[PDB]
């Protein structure tokens, strides 16, 4: 055989609809390797997962496992260049990312199918021998301190690290996962310790026996084998014992507790946690997936339905949680409402009444069998995933499951084990419960404070009298076991291609009532179909009042159909219903077997909807706080939000939405629904297994239902208006300035507006964005260390495009403006002095990126729908533009920069958005920035838009 290969798993059980070939193999140094052959993919990928996470970090240096992760992308032995890895992938249409979990560390990347070997070699140099520079450390420690700083005021990370801190100080579960400058630079210097620690950690835990490699490409299995053996059989083996944690962070002094936590946002979530043993080895039966399916069920007579009718909660989740090798968690989280906050004890009481209901009726074999079929069907008709994320997740689960049963690891279930189900369910008792209640009402009534995040909370102990009530609980009659799933598809027949088949979605129904687009699937051949519907109505966004009544309408509708839709949700038939600036948006995606049944029930309940006052007040209240929760979002998101407000003709801010919300009464909404459904216009897209007559019948069903119940009469052609983008003048600089009231960091967005989305203007922008794509990430973040979040690319809106820069940091926005302007000059100098080859590199890179065909049906449906909502209908856009792209020269880009993006451009449409930090003032080497003209301050948006023209709309094809 082969000396470098220990064993070969030539037979990997794959999906029958999967045409890709798989070959698993175990190397001599104990590296589990899986190879995927896909000769038709446009982008190859590879991923390596080390079984060492941030739980094995030294007690002195916390967040070291995550820190070393960032140090690997900064120069190696064979490739001493600091940004060799990053630059190489960008020049060949690729990307890369990494993340450190509890006991995991994943590194993945995708790239063009031609330069896989060259990229795989550079990736292999990260584990053999990494050079940790003395200055790269001093800069990356700021990058780690900044990526943690952006998560300080985030309720998710605050509650995640709190359940760690409230646990056992001895157990590694309480250790800091992320880590900041204090743990990486400050503390080691205060005790005289760091680069030597990076070397010792990489040489003690980053061993071959704890690594898993998964490579995907166009190459054959033998060529991929000879390449992995070439690069990964040289990895040093040390046989490091896999860190196991048989101990549990929770114990006698950690159970039966009350953690009253004060959140940043105005939310009220209750967290019930059950400490359970590691269920990873029971994957063949998966008792946690069983009990999670019953408890978190949203169907009639479930735990959610009972807690809804009492007017206590809105959502219920659900299932088991992940911890580490040795322990897991079985959580039942639930949101506290007006009455739910006052009846928390009664909510948990009902929970145990449902748990007692499961213990009473005992383990059901027909339920497990139903889960077996649902999972088996979902595995067979499984969508082809994108190479990058696919190899990333497989490499992570390669350590747990055998080589031949990886693709079928989390999908197929074998032998019914009720005793294992009974074992987990036994751990679900009031004697083993951990309650964590979060509310804003606990403001100023807390005693303790978290260390790293500074979270205000108070720890209490639930009285045994309450425990007795939960133990001695009578079975509730409302709690019923879910019946047989009547939405399980039985017909998977793929309808043969018709004689009038079309490569692109065509228009088959153009009337005053509705416009219909139909594209029968001819690429993926599954038994699924995507049904998107866009309802146009003037009374949806005419004023903040109707804007609120429209949102409350669809939220009440989704609330009323929550039970009926969930039964089809488990059967792979989902639906999405959200309101847009033009009206409504319905999107039913899933199996087309019982799909018209779901759609009919949606439309029929949509036309004739009777509002419940109790549910009206609850949703209205939750929507009010949601508009106040927007107050605490990250700066860069506010910059993008404000820019959307500025450039758009009509837009309503959050503050005047809640002001109008205070005038929304129940009788007003009842009279608003028929008025809203009075006149409509439906632009749809039916893309799937259905035929033309089937599509027409579906459209006919929707129209005939709306006409019968809601009396819908068609709109006018001149009544269908699309909003425009504000036309900026030449050499005009505009700045909007507001403050982020929560985060102590500042965000900024610089938008250079270009001209009207034409083939010429499109490729002049995207190619330029391609050239400056990687240098932006390298100069602004890797070299100058402005902030963790550095982004640059094209911005398309209302048929108008341009170049946008998005940076979040703690530095002055005006300083960031200068550094970007200085970046534009040194990049214009770069393009001017590069060879012809250095230009064809970026052309070919963008070309492959644009020609990356969709992976599944929902991906292709998203592209077509985007070309429809933009009302351009340019389905052949990618082919025409790339053809024009390869015919471009460098002189055209220089002219494009001098005319549109130069510091003294004759047509420079530059608008900026400054988002300051909380306590930052308002009034006030390297490449030096040019002198910038005096900008204009935007204080009132109405007076701003009234003083500027409006762009025309892009005419369809």
């Amino acid at each position: 055989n082969n000396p470098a290969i220990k064993r070969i798993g030539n037979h990997i059980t794959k999906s029958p609809e999967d045409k890709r070939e798989y070959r698993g193999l175990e190397l001599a140094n104990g590296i589990k390797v899986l190879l995927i052959s896909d000769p038709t993919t446009d982008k190859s990928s590879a991923a390596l997962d080390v079984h060492i996470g941030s739980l094995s970090d030294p007690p002195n240096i916390a967040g070291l496992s995550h820190f070393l992760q960032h140090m690997l992308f900064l120069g190696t032995k064979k490739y001493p260049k600091e940004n060799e890895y990053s630059q190489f992938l960008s020049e060949h249409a690729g990307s890369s990312n990494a993340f450190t979990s509890g006991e995991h560390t994943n590194y993945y990347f995708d790239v063009s199918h031609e330069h896989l070997e060259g990229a795989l070699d550079r990736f292999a140099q990260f584990f053999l021998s990494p050079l940790f520079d003395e200055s790269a450390k001093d800069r990356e420690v700021n990058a780690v301190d900044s990526e943690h700083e952006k998560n300080v005021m985030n309720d998710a990370w605050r509650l995640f690290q709190l359940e760690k801190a409230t646990g056992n100080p001895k157990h590694p579960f309480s250790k800091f996962g992320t880590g900041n400058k204090y743990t990486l630079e400050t503390r080691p210097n205060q005790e005289g310790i760091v680069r030597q620690e990076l070397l010792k950690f990489h040489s003690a835990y980053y061993s071959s026996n704890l690594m898993a490699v998964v490579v995907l490409g166009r190459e054959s299995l033998d060529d991929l084998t000879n390449l992995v053996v070439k690069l990964f059989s040289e990895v040093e083996n040390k046989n490091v014992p896999l860190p196991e944690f048989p101990e549990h962070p929770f114990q006698e002094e950690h159970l039966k507790q009350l953690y009253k936590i004060v959140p940043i946002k105005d939310i009220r979530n209750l967290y019930v946690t059950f400490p359970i043993p590691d269920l990873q080895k029971y994957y063949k039966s998966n008792p946690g997936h069983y009990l999670g399916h019953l408890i978190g069920h949203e169907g009639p007579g479930s735990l959610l339905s009972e807690l809804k009718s009492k007017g206590w909660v809105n959502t219920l989740v659900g299932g088991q949680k992940e911890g580490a090798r040795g322990f897991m968690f079985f959580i039942i989280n639930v949101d506290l409402t007006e009455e739910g906050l006052l009846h928390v004890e009664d909510i948990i009481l009902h929970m145990f009444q449902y748990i007692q209901k499961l213990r009473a009726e005992g383990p059901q074999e027909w339920v497990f069998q139903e889960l077996k079929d649902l999972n088996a069907v979902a595995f067979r008709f499984k969508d082809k995933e994108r190479p990058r994320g696919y190899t990333s997740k497989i490499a992570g689960i390669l350590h747990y499951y055998p080589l031949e049963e990886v693709l079928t690891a989390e999908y197929l279930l074998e032998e019914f084990r009720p005793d294992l189900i009974e074992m987990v369910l036994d751990k679900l008792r009031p004697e083993n419960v951990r309650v964590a209640i979060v509310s804003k009402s606990f403001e100023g009534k807390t005693d303790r404070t978290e260390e790293w995040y500074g979270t205000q909370y108070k720890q209490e102990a639930i009285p045994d009298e309450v425990i007795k009530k939960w133990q001695n609980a009578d079975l509730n009659g409302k709690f019923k076991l879910p019946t047989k799933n009547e939405f399980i598809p039985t017909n998977f027949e793929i309808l043969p291609l018709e004689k009038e088949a079309t490569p692109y979605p065509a228009l088959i129904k153009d009337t005053a009532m509705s416009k219909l687009w139909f594209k029968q699937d001819d690429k993926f051949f599954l038994p699924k179909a995507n049904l998107n519907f866009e309802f146009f109505s003037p009374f949806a966004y005419v004023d903040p009042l109707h804007s609120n009544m429209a949102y409350l309408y669809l939220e009440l509708l989704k609330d009323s159909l929550n039970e009926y839709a969930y039964a089809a949700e488990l059967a792979g038939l989902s639906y999405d219903l959200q309101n847009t600036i033009y009206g409504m948006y319905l999107s039913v995606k899933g199996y087309n077997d019982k799909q018209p049944i779901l759609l009919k029930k949606i439309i029929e309940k949509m036309a004739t909807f009777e509002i419940d006052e109790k549910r009206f007040e609850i949703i209205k209240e939750a929507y009010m706080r949601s508009l106040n929760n927007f107050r605490a979002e990250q700066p860069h998101q506010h910059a993008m939000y404000y820019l959307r407000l500025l450039m758009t003709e009509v837009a309503w801010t959050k503050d005047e939405l809640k002001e109008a919300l205070d005038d929304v009464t129940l009788p007003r909404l009842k009279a608003f629904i028929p008025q809203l459904l009075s006149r409509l216009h439906i632009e749809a897209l039916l893309h799937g297994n259905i035929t033309k007559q089937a599509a027409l019948g579906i459209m006919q069903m929707v129209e005939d239902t709306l006409i019968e119940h809601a009396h819908t009469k068609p709109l006018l052609p001149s009544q269908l208006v699309r909003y425009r983008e504000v036309q900026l003048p030449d050499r005009g600089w505009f700045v909007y300035q507001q403050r982020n009231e929560v985060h102590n960091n500042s965000g900024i967005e610089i938008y250079y507006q270009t001209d009207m989305q034409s083939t010429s203007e499109n490729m002049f922008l995207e190619l330029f964005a391609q050239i400056i794509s990687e240098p932006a990430f390298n100069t602004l973040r890797t070299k100058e260390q402005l902030g963790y979040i550095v982004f640059s690319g094209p911005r398309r809106a209302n048929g108008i495009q341009g170049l946008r820069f998005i940076i979040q940091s703690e530095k002055p926005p005006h300083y960031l403006e200068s550094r970007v302007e200085a970046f534009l000059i040194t990049m214009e100098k770069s393009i001017e002095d590069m060879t012809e080859e250095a230009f064809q590199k970026h052309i070919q890179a963008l070309a492959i990126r644009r020609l990356d065909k969709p992976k599944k049906l929902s991906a292709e449906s998203a592209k077509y729908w985007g070309e429809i909502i933009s009302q351009q209908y340019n389905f052949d856009r990618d082919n025409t533009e790339v053809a024009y792209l390869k015919t471009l020269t460098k002189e055209d880009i220089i002219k494009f920069y001098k005319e549109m993006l130069a510091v003294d451009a004759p047509r420079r449409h530059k608008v900026s958005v400054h988002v300051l930090a909380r306590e930052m003032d308002s009034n006030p080497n390297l490449s030096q920035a040019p002198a910038l003209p005096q900008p204009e301050v935007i204080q009132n948006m109405t007076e701003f838009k009234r003083g500027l023209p409006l762009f025309p709309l892009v005419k369809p094809h």
Partner: antibody, heavy 120, light 94 residues
Framework: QLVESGGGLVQPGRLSCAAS????????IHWVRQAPGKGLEWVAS????????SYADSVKGRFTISADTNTAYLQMNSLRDTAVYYC??????????????????????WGQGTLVTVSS | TQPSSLSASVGDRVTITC???VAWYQQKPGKAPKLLIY???SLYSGVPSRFSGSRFTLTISSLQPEDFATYYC??????????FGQGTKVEIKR
Amino acid sequence: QLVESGGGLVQPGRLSCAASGFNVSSYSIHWVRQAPGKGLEWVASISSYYGSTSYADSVKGRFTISADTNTAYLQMNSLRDTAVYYCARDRVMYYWSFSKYGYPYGMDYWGQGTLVTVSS
Amino acid sequence: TQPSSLSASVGDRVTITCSSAVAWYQQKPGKAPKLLIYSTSSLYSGVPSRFSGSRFTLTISSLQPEDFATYYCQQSSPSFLITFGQGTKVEIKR
């Protein structure tokens, strides 16, 4: 496979089964005796994982079952009771000792047995 | 809880009678008892398709000379208790 030992001469008034091919830490080892000229009769079984020991209504107090991480044992002090002792193992893994119902998963592998007679 | 003697010739249909979902075992005279059926109805690997289970009963399709032995049952009651049966011996009637 299972390797039994310890049975033989005993005056009125330990057994060792060394497991091979698997680990005892993830399986339940059972002991079954059979009186010469009669049928089978279960005496005591142990689950090392969940740490629970079970005994019959005719041997409890006298007998004692144990194991080690891979070999299992059975300490019998007061004898009378003369039979052939076999040892078997559940086919499935991690069978929960505590139960309110009955789930008899078959005992796939056995041992030929070791004879032990008690007589004055 | 299981007769103790059945007289049936070769090639005949045998029906041996006997918590929940009992199991079935076979012990030939001399050596260790082997498993044939673990849940109510389940054929263990290597076991002939002549054997089959149903409700607490064991059936043999075509009685072979190699099937002449003493069959036992196994009922794993709760609290980790395992109880066998009286054991039925299969004889020939010639």
